[PDB]
Design a protein around this ligand. Sequence first.
Ligand SMILES: Cc1cc2c(cc1C)N(S(=O)(=O)O)[C@@H]1C(=O)NC(=O)N=C1N2C[C@H](O)[C@H](O)[C@H](O)COP(=O)(O)OP(=O)(O)OC[C@H]1O[C@@H](n2cnc3c(N)ncnc32)[C@H](O)[C@@H]1O
Ligand SMILES: Cc1cc2c(cc1C)N(S(=O)(=O)O)[C@@H]1C(=O)NC(=O)N=C1N2C[C@H](O)[C@H](O)[C@H](O)COP(=O)(O)OP(=O)(O)OC[C@H]1O[C@@H](n2cnc3c(N)ncnc32)[C@H](O)[C@@H]1O
Ligand SMILES: OC[C@H]1O[C@H](O)[C@H](O)[C@@H](O)[C@@H]1O
Ligand SMILES: O=S([O-])[O-]
Ligand SMILES: O=S([O-])[O-]
Ligand SMILES: O=S([O-])[O-]
Ligand SMILES: O=S([O-])[O-]
Lengths: 104, 52, 574, 576
Amino acid sequence: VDWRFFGRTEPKEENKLWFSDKITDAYNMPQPTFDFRFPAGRTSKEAEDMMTDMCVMSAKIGGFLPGSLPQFMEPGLVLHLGGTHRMGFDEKEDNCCVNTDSRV
Amino acid sequence: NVIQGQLMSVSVPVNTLVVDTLSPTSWQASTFFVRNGSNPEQDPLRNLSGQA
Amino acid sequence: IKYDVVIVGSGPIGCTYARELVGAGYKVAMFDIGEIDSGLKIGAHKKNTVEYQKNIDKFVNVIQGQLMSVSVPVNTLVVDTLSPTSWQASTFFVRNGSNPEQDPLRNLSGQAVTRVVGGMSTAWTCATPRFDREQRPLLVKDDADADDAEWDRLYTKAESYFQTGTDQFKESIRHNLVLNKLTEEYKGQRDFQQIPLAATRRSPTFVEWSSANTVFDLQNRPNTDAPEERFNLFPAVACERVVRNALNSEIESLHIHDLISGDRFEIKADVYVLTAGAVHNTQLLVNSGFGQLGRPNPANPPELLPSLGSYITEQSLVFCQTVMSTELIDSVKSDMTIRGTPGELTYSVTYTPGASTNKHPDWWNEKVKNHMMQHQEDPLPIPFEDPEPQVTTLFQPSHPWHTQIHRDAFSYGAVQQSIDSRLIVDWRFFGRTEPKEENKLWFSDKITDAYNMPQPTFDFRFPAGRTSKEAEDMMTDMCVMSAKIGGFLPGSLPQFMEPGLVLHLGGTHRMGFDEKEDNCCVNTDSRVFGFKNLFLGGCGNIPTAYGANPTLTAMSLAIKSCEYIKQNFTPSPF
Amino acid sequence: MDIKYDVVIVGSGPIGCTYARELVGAGYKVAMFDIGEIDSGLKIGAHKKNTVEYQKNIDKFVNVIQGQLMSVSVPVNTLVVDTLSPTSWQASTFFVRNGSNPEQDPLRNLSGQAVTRVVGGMSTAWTCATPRFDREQRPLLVKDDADADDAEWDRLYTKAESYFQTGTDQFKESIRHNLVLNKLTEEYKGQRDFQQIPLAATRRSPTFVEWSSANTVFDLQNRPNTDAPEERFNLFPAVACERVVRNALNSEIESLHIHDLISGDRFEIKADVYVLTAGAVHNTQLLVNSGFGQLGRPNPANPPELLPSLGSYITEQSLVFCQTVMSTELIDSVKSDMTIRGTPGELTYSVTYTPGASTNKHPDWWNEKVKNHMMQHQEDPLPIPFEDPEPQVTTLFQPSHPWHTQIHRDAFSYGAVQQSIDSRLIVDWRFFGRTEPKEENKLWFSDKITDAYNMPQPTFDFRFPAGRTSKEAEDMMTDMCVMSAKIGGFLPGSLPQFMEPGLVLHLGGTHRMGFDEKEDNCCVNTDSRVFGFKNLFLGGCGNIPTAYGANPTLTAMSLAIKSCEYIKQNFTPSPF
Ligand SMILES: Cc1cc2c(cc1C)N(S(=O)(=O)O)[C@@H]1C(=O)NC(=O)N=C1N2C[C@H](O)[C@H](O)[C@H](O)COP(=O)(O)OP(=O)(O)OC[C@H]1O[C@@H](n2cnc3c(N)ncnc32)[C@H](O)[C@@H]1O
Ligand SMILES: Cc1cc2c(cc1C)N(S(=O)(=O)O)[C@@H]1C(=O)NC(=O)N=C1N2C[C@H](O)[C@H](O)[C@H](O)COP(=O)(O)OP(=O)(O)OC[C@H]1O[C@@H](n2cnc3c(N)ncnc32)[C@H](O)[C@@H]1O
Ligand SMILES: OC[C@H]1O[C@H](O)[C@H](O)[C@@H](O)[C@@H]1O
Ligand SMILES: O=S([O-])[O-]
Ligand SMILES: O=S([O-])[O-]
Ligand SMILES: O=S([O-])[O-]
Ligand SMILES: O=S([O-])[O-]
C-alpha cells in the first residue's frame, strides 16, 4: 500500500515564481525561476506533524517496505502548485490578479 | 515510466557534482559552468526542484 | 600444565572472572582464540586513540573490520552480465564460506562475532543501564525486596568495575538541547537522563571509554604491581572441547588448539569458566556433548542440557537520524543580543552574565558568544568541538523498549558530509523479545566453520504476539519522539535493522532456578546443572525478554558466580 | 624523556625505521616520535593483516584500511539536500563544514590522498609490493657514469630487500597464481616478461604469510634491553612534532618542538641530527611550519627565500583498476590431466591422473591437489582447492609499456567485495602510471585554515600533465582492458575505471632530491640532506624527483640507507 500525505502551504509574498530577462527556455521564452521556501511557522509545524501522522497511521496497516521508508519528497514533485495568478475580490486588498469570474 | 518521460523540469540549478575520475585525456572542466539547459538564475537551495 | 581456574574468552565477562578470582589468590589461565589488538593496554577500547577521537566517523570501519558474520546463507543473486568467456555457474552452489544449513528467511543475518583480545569491548558503545524488574532474571524467588537488594549490590559492583557514570556529557550544548526539549515535551509522562556510560572524561575533547582492560588489565602476574597474584593470558588459542566425566558431574580437561604452532594440548584446572560469547559458548558446549549436534530432531531429545540453544532472544532494533530543528538551533542563542551582519564592522553578540532571566548558564552563553564572534563565517551557534548528545529514556511498562538518542560509532552507523554534523542525532530503539522454545541456535553435524568447529545455524523469527506488536509500537514511538527534535535526515530514514545486527543475543544457555521447570542450562550461581566445576558467563545466561543493553547485567551475574566459586574452591598455595 | 639525543627521528613508518635500524645499530642515542599510537599488538608497528583472523577473512581487512586513512584535503561540499523536513535547520549557503578546506579547488585536487597516524605508519596496512625501479624511473645517484650509478643502486636495493625480507617465491605453490602467470607468459611470448610481484613477506605455512612492515625493519622496542644491551632507543608515541627551529644562518637545526598529546604539554628536544620521516605530506607541512618554502597560497611575485622548490613538482600516479572472473578455458585447463569417470556424488565417481606421465601438462603436486579437492568436495564444481593462495603477478614497467602492473588479490581501501561470484575466480588488476614532474603541480599549506592537529591545512593544486602523462595514462587503461581479457571478462561492479586522484597513495617529489638546488629544482641532495643545513635530513617518497610507476617505498628506503651512511661518517655517537 502507498501512503501519500499532502500538506497545505500558507501564501507568502516572498515565495515567488519569476522569469529571467536573459536566460531562455527550450521554446525561447523567459526562463522560469523559483524563490521558494516552506514558510517557517504553521506550514512547517503542520508538515512535520503530517509526517508523524503518516508514520502513526500507516503502522495500523503494516510496517514500512524497505526501500520506501517515510520521507519528504523533493519540493514540487507533488505538482500541486497554486497561487501564481491568484483570485480574490479586490486586486489591492486581496493581493491578487483575477476576480471571482477569473477575469484579469 | 510513461509519467517520467513526459515531466520536463521547470528550473534546474547549475550542477556542482565533482567528477574527478575522468581519464586524463578527456576534456575536463575548470569551473561549474552552465550546461545541459540548466538555469544559472536558480538558487539550488530555494527551489521547487521537482516542479515539472 | 595445571591451573586453579581456566577462563575461555578475554571479553569483559571473562575479565570479570579474572578480576574477582586473580584478586582472591587463585592461579588463573585465560585463553582467547584472538590476538592482542589495542596497543600496550591489553584488551582496551580501540576508540581511545587521539586519532579516533578526532575522527569518530572512521571508527565505524574498525568495527566493520572485526565483525565476522555467524551464518551466511547460500547466495542466489543472479549475475547475468558476465562475459561469455567467463566461467559461469550452473547452480547456486556453496561458496565463499556460506552455510547451506541456513534458511535465509529464518536467520539472524546481522549476527556476528569478534575474535580479538577484549572481545567486543574493544569496539562497543559503553552503554551500561540496569534492567528494571520487568526485564531482570530473578535471583531470589518469592521475595521481591531480597531480590532487589541482591541485584542492587551486584550492579553497584559491576558499575565500579566498568567505571559507569552519568555526568561525562553534561557540558555538551547538543546533549542539553535534546534532553531538555524531550523532557519538556513529555510533560512528566517519561523520564530522560544521560545514558549511563562506562567511561571517564579526560578532557573536554577526550573520553577514556571502558573495556575489558578497565575490568582487568590482562597483564601476566606476578608482576611488580601484583607480586602475589598469578595470571597468564594465552592469545591465539582456539578452545575446542571440555571433557565430561562419565557421571556428567565434573569437567576433567579443556582441549585447545594453539593456532600459531598448530599443536593441540589439554589443560587441567579445578574450575572451568566459559565466557566466549553467546554463540561460541553454545558451540563449545555442543562440541563437548551437551545438547544435540545437528538439525534439531524432537523425536530424539538430548539427554544433557536439553534447553541449550533453545529460547534464544535477540532484540528488534530500529534506527534513524534527525537534523536539528530551526527552533532548537535558535534557542541556543536565545540570551544573546545580536546586532549587525556577521562579517561586518558593526556586528556584535552580547549577553548579561548572571542574569536571572537568561535561559542558559554563563558557561553556555560564553561558549556561544565566543563561537559567534570568533567564527563569523559559521552560521550555527554551536561550538565546533561541542561533545556528542548521550540521552535516554529507559524502558518502562508503558514504553517497553530501550532508547539511545546520541551520536556514536556502530557498524551500521551513517556517514555523510552534506549536513553539518552538529545538527545530526542518532536514534536507536531496542525492543524486548519473548523467549520461545522454537527459536534456536544449533550447530551442523557436517558443515564446519573457519576454525573447523561445527557451523552455527539459526532458526529464528520474532515471536508473533506481544514481541511483534511492541516492535512495531516501538518504531512508531521513535517516529513520534524524534519529530520533537527535528525531521529525519535523508538517507537515514526510520527502519528496522537486519535481524541480529544489534548484537544483543541472549538465552542461548539460559539461567533459572530449576533445569526442567525453568527450561534452563545454568543455575543462579551460573553453574551448569549437574556439574560441580563448570560455569558459563555472558549474555547467553539471560533468560528474560530484555530491551536494555545486556552486558552490565551479564557482568552482575558473573560476580555472583565468582562468589560461589570463592565459597566452594580453595586456591592453591602460592 | 631526556631532552638531548644524538639523533631524533620524526615518524615511525618503514622509512623512519630504516634510519633507526642503521643508526641505533651504529651506537647512536636515538629518539623517535610518532603523532599516532601503538596499534598492532605486541610487535610494535607490525602489519595488522598478520592475525589469524585476517588471514582467514582477507576481505574484512579492507575496513581496517579505510578506518586509518584520513583524507588530506576535502573541498567544501555543494551537494543539494532538498528533502529535509520543513522544521529542520536548513542552510542558505554551502558554508564550511565537517573539517572541509575552503582553500581547496575541488577540480584541481588529489581527493583520494590520505594519511595514517599510527605507529608503523602505512606499513601497518600496505600490500608489500617492493619492485626496483629501472633506469627510466629512477633518479641518478652518480653523474656521468651509468655503470657506477647502476652498481650503487644495486647495492642499496639489495640492502633494502634484506631489511624488508623481499622475495619472489612465496606464492609459487598457488594454482591460481601459476594459471594466470603462465597464461600471460604464453599470450605475450617474447614481447613482455611476467614474474611474481616482489613482496616483502615471509610464508610461515600454506595458509599464513607474515607480511612485512616497519616492525620487520626495526622492532621499535626501547633499548637498552636484554637482546640489545649496548643499544639506545626510545619511541615516543602520541607526540605531534610541530617545528624544527632554524638558526638565523639557516645552516643548522637547533631543536625540535613537540606537543605531547596525552599530557597537553609542549617541549623542545635537542639532537645532533634531525631526520624527518613523516610522510610526503607531513614532512612538507612540518618544514613549511618551520619557515621553509612559503606559507599560504603560492604567489610567484615573491618566491620564498628558503627551499623555493619545496611542495612543487609533486607527482602522483594515475591508477586504473578492474576485476575479472576467470575464463572457462582457464578453469578447464586446471584439470586437463584428470581422467573422470561417473557423476559427482555417485559411488563410482573417480577423478584420477597418472603421476609422472610425459603427457601431463602439470606437475604431480598440482595434480594431487586438484584430484584431492575434486574427490573430497564432490559438491563443488571448481577444480581449485579452497585454500589455494592468491595470485601475485606482474609485468614490470618498460619503455614500451611505461606503467607498473599488479595482477593479484589483496586488500586495499578501494577494494571490492561481493559474495555472488566464487572468490577463486576473481583477480584484481591495478595498473599504475608515471607522472611528469611539473612546477605548477603543488602541495601548499593555508595561512589561515588549520587541520585537526592545529597545523597549517594542506591544499593541493594538481592536474595530470596534459601530454605524455595523459597519453600514457589512457594507453595504460587500454593495456589493462587488452591484457585482462586474456584471463577472463570483467566482474560486474568492478569495471575498468580510473581511481580518484591520489587514492593510490604514491605521492612523490614534495621535497625532491637532486645534485644542485637551483639546476635540479630540488630540496635535498643525494645524501638526503636539506641544502644549506649540516644536520637535517628527509626520508621518504617526497624525495623521489622522477616520474615513476612502480611502488615507491623500496626506492625511498634505498635512499635512506645512503643517507644513513653519510650520517655515520660525519657524526659521532655519544659515549655510552
Ligand atoms: C560490537 C558492539 C557490541 C556492543 C555495542 C556496540 C558494538 C559496536 N554496544 S551497542 O551499540 O550494542 O548498544 C553495546 C553497549 O553500548 N552496551 C552493551 O551492554 N553492549 C554493547 N555491545 C555488546 C557487548 O560488546 C557484548 O555484550 C559484550 O562484549 C559481551 O562480553 P563477553 O560475554 O565477554 O563476550 P565477547 O564477545 O565480548 O568476548 C568473547 C571472547 O571469547 C573469545 N572466543 C570465542 N570463541 C572462543 C574459543 N572457542 N576459544 C577461545 N576464545 C574464544 C572471543 O575471541 C572474544 O574475545
Ligand atoms: C595504505 C597503503 C599504502 C600502500 C599500499 C597499500 C596500502 C593499503 N601499497 S599499494 O597498494 O599502493 O601497492 C603499497 C605497496 O604494495 N608497496 C609500496 O611500496 N607502497 C605501498 N603503499 C604506500 C607505503 O605504505 C608508503 O609508501 C610507506 O609507508 C611510506 O613510508 P614512510 O615514508 O615511512 O611514511 P608513513 O606514512 O608510513 O609513516 C609516517 C609516520 O609519520 C607519522 N607522522 C606524520 N606527521 C607527524 C608529525 N607531525 N609528528 C610526528 N609524527 C608524524 C605518521 O603517524 C606515520 O606513522
Ligand atoms: O574476589 C576478591 C576481590 O578481587 C578483587 O581485588 C576485586 O577487585 C574485588 O572487587 C574482589 O572482591
Ligand atoms: O556428584 S554430584 O556432583 O552430583
Ligand atoms: O549439580 S546440581 O544441579 O545437582
Ligand atoms: O581439497 S581442498 O579444497 O580441501
Ligand atoms: O650545506 S651545503 O653543502 O648544501
